[PDB]
């Protein structure tokens, strides 16, 4: 489904393919996550990252 609930999202935290898709395909993530993401686009990664890594 790759719909981004967290496990998509988890193996690309890893490797490091989160960063790939564009900026409206990030919010959908931020928007599951409830985080504040940014108007610009690898904001949303760090959004992500960071609710997926210390």
Same mark, same amino acid.
């Given at each position: 489904?790759?719909?981004?609930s967290?496990?998509?999202?988890?193996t690309?935290? @890893?490797?490091g393919?989160? /960063?790939? =898709?564009?900026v409206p395909?990030?919010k959908e993530?931020?928007?599951?996550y /409830?985080?504040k @993401? /940014?108007?610009?686009?690898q904001e949303?990664?760090?959004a992500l990252t960071?609710? =997926?890594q210390?």
């Amino acid at each position: 489904k790759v719909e981004y609930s967290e496990e998509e999202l988890k193996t690309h935290i @890893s490797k490091g393919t989160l /960063g790939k =898709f564009t900026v409206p395909m990030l919010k959908e993530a931020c928007r599951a996550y /409830g985080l504040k @993401s /940014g108007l610009k686009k690898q904001e949303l990664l760090e959004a992500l990252t960071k609710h =997926f890594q210390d």
